[PDB]
Symmetry: D2
Subunit: 331 residues, 4 copies
């Protein structure tokens, strides 16, 4: 009698269980950039969104759903209750507090810790086996906080870390050199941000080391000021925030790329933040960006880059800073 039933004969009951589900936590501008980038690359057969702002959340979900004709991701869901995130292979954390003025660093972090104490247990409860990917800043610290709270082995807790900044570096490199970023290679490692380390000895096109051609590369004795590009990279995000208010598109694309490696088990190497106690001369429980092999089991291996003693010292300094801070957090 009903039209559906007149039109369609049902032969199979529902067993409905997601096979490649991704959850994004937080629907601010970064969260939604990750979401659209992930939808348009067909990485998931289901997408879930969660946030505390219920109207905003429902709106974003609906807008995405109205695009269904143009996507190959058949199920998009959302809710404040984390049961909608259940059985995710990958859960991306973009939520957090924004540093107020006068706040102080340690105080900003703690407020983010307090948010994660609510988020992380809810993620783990409904997706015990997922990979966690943290994007919230400061990423290296907050990836640690998510690791400790979730109880997950280190291979399953990832920080986007320096992934986008390495992408920005390759872009600026390509602009100076007149070739596409895809063909330009450079690595930024360590602590996300201004303390991050541009590995000059690895920068090359077509296997041709720029440092071998141009020995001054990276020093202050450089007429071409290539050391500036790293600073350009670091500065360029705050430049963008100053211009449009925030950044979204690039980080979203960045995160989708990582998600691809994970969902398809590509085992590509990305500069991302991993718990590297024991490597790179690091002694504390700290996340730093190093070239990681990324696949369906998270970070399985790490490339041991050969660093100068200065570069090694930089990583140690950041490890001390990060640790000193984490030592003062309330969990």
């Amino acid at each position: 009698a009903a039209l559906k039933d007149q039109l369609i004969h049902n032969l199979l009951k529902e067993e409905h269980v997601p096979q490649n589900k991704i959850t994004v936590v937080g629907v601010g501008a970064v969260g939604m950039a990750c979401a659209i980038s992930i939808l348009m690359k067909d990485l998931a057969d289901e997408l879930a969104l969660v946030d505390v702002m219920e109207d905003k959340l429902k709106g974003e979900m609906m807008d995405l759903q109205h695009g269904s004709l143009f996507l190959r991701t058949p199920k998009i869901v959302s809710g404040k209750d984390y049961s909608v995130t259940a059985n995710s292979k990958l859960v991306i954390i973009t939520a957090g507090a924004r540093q107020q003025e006068g706040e102080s660093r340690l105080n900003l972090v703690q407020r983010n810790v307090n948010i994660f104490k609510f988020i992380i247990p809810n993620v783990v409860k409904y997706s015990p086996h997922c990979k966690l990917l943290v994007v919230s800043n400061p990423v290296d610290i907050l990836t640690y906080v998510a690791w400790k709270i979730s109880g997950f082995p280190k291979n399953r807790v990832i920080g986007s870390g320096c992934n986008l900044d390495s992408a920005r570096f390759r872009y600026l490199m390509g602009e100076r050199l007149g070739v596409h970023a895809l063909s330009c290679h450079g690595w930024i490692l360590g602590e996300h941000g201004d303390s991050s380390v541009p590995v000059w000895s690895g920068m090359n096109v077509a296997g041709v080391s720029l440092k071998t051609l141009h020995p001054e590369l990276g020093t202050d004795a450089d007429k071409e000021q290539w050391k500036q590009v790293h600073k350009q990279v670091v500065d360029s995000a705050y430049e963008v925030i100053k211009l449009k208010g925030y950044t979204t598109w690039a980080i979203g694309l960045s995160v989708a790329d990582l998600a691809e490696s994970i969902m398809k088990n590509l085992r590509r190497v990305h500069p991302i933040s991993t718990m590297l106690k024991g490597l790179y001369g690091i002694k504390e429980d700290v996340f730093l960006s190093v070239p990681c092999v990324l696949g369906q089991n998270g970070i399985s291996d790490v490339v041991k880059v050969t660093l100068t003693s200065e570069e090694e010292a930089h990583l140690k300094k950041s490890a001390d800073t990060l640790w000193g801070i984490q030592k003062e957090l309330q969990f």
Copy 2:
């Protein structure tokens, strides 16, 4: 010599004439959704963004540029000056403010567009879209095949999604057309709704009427209201409109000749005698709209289109260019 020249021997004096360039005018939430959707579909070898808000504009450009490693569009440019848009195949208009005001705005945007891309196709998304497509058309001087309104494209996609939810199948497999004037006055063509060539109206003759126990009529209402419901929740809409626009971009750039519910100057057809744009099923390719399907309409569906034409013309009569 410079490091670049130690690394790279140049063999050709490079001339950059973009071959598959697309411009988005307006970097609001709609314009930027179009941009990112277009970028992720690999439709252009160059993207230009233009807006009057210079800081916002430069910020959006830089943000997209930073994602270059993950894209296949080698050049992204922007500026308030329209030289940056030069030689575009397709220029998508998302800027706007009424109507005589938009006329005044378009009186600046469109001639700037035509000056730097004399041969481009125009795609207007700005509301009220049927009227502004007419405006952009008159000011442009372009023949009608080259000026296109997003029209009922998204609302059809919304309708098809809601059809899919009700039937338990993907929107791709649910067919249905919303035509005419974009918005509250649009026409849900009940007679064409079908899955796998099976008319819903033939199975269920009450489809779309008040006596319809399933209230399919409310589905069209829900479509007409959905933008409003989404704005109420998040403040605006973006993703779906951007996706629907990139899909039109795709048919154009790849000369697909797919059929879309978009707004075209339909004088001479469907009984209309004025210069107005309404959504009908249009064949869309590298030359824009070259053909339209003649939907068989009920006598009152027809009178509904004629009414929208007189409504649009009534407004269009006033304006001055």
Copy 3:
């Protein structure tokens, strides 16, 4: 210290389990067309190939593997031993014998049964939960054979059936109308091949019924002879075989499209062959093509097309003929 261990520090011990594995059985031209199309649509994270021709098999695997740089499917495996197919979501059967001089078509069918008696139990053993998609001809009969041998519920055994033929029909429709195949709708249903049924009443563009515009559509009294469009469809495989000796590309593309719906749980409606006893007036255990909702559990629902009395008669006759052949096969 090995170069690998010098370069890369291992942090995890992988027990590799494929999450979106597809297997193609038979690396003839049809099988390798399915394989390349599936690879270029990023539908799987692992591809396995099996065939009895061991050299040919290894050669195809290696050729595909040499392309890994340009693909996003990290693992391509092969072997005559079906352990390589273990834990496949989807297994595509293109293996078959070709007729000799010589033998009747029935005798040719039985030899394909004997081939399936070997393949199907091996497939089921290593992938108990997979869906089966049978492409080998005659496809309605061989899909039934696979159903029977496998013991799978009907929702999981799918025949490619009239999927390609409908695609061909839509292409020829679009050539006549000056519109892309994506916007021309029309269905070829029933038994794959000569006896297939062009459902004239369903043919439309933008929801405008051609039949209503042109009541002669598909009749002998039709001055535009649209029936010849169906005849072109029925003959197109033969025509391509006369010119190039076989067909590959189109069937491969049409199979990858079915694979997409399955791997991504899209629930798109495809004209494919399904066990339809109990529907469409059919009283026998036969597979015929009807519009099927295709997803991760295979065929969950079928659309009930309104058929004329003469159309129902063609289907029933097809069911009789199919069933008649099936009783004569040795299982």
Copy 4:
């Protein structure tokens, strides 16, 4: 009134000109692998095939056309007559004479030269401004022949060169190290074939030089025998031919990737053969593979790789042997 005219009202009476047309010359297994890969990457709005085997040609065209529903390339054409190739952006030559015996090299080349004397003039007649991409072996010599016959400037005449062999190298590299080929970097340069040059110095993951971790890399004294990996690349085509009779998929994928850089003006660096007189110590009109910037105007720039004296002389010798043969060609 015809059904078409009842259904569709024509508003525009317009003409032809394809905007991103690609032509493939030769519908052997290589040309068709190029074609399907190009079709599935959405690189063209029109595809033309040409070959002297008219039935085969028409068969392949039809087979591809039947897959229209599943593609986004609206027009596929073919003909023995080159007018079908008019206004191509890019023309890919995969036609050539085969090997028999008693190779007076300047014979199975001079015969290819006589074949090109027919093809290339026809190509340039209908596409005066196309880029030429030669894949036929021997590729460095045949790219020179097409360059001479066409009258084209060197930037627009390209040979596939060592592009696939580098991809194979990066694949084998990935297998040894446990990471995807996309993250494994290495270049094979110079004369395509046995005499190609593995550039040991440039091989790396994430900017870490393997030669620097492992100085013996590439030498006979290499305990890990990485020299054999290059030899394995040089032999792989022969190994695959031995197994399946030819190679197709890998070369096709590699060629489509060059086509992408051209059609989208990506300016990526690929190891392809380019007329390198004046560079790398060479003074003759020959084509060798070096890292090239590839865009909408073909090869506009070359990367100058730092070579060992041993590597340099190896390239110089290749140049002289190529010229030695080219001298003896009758045009």
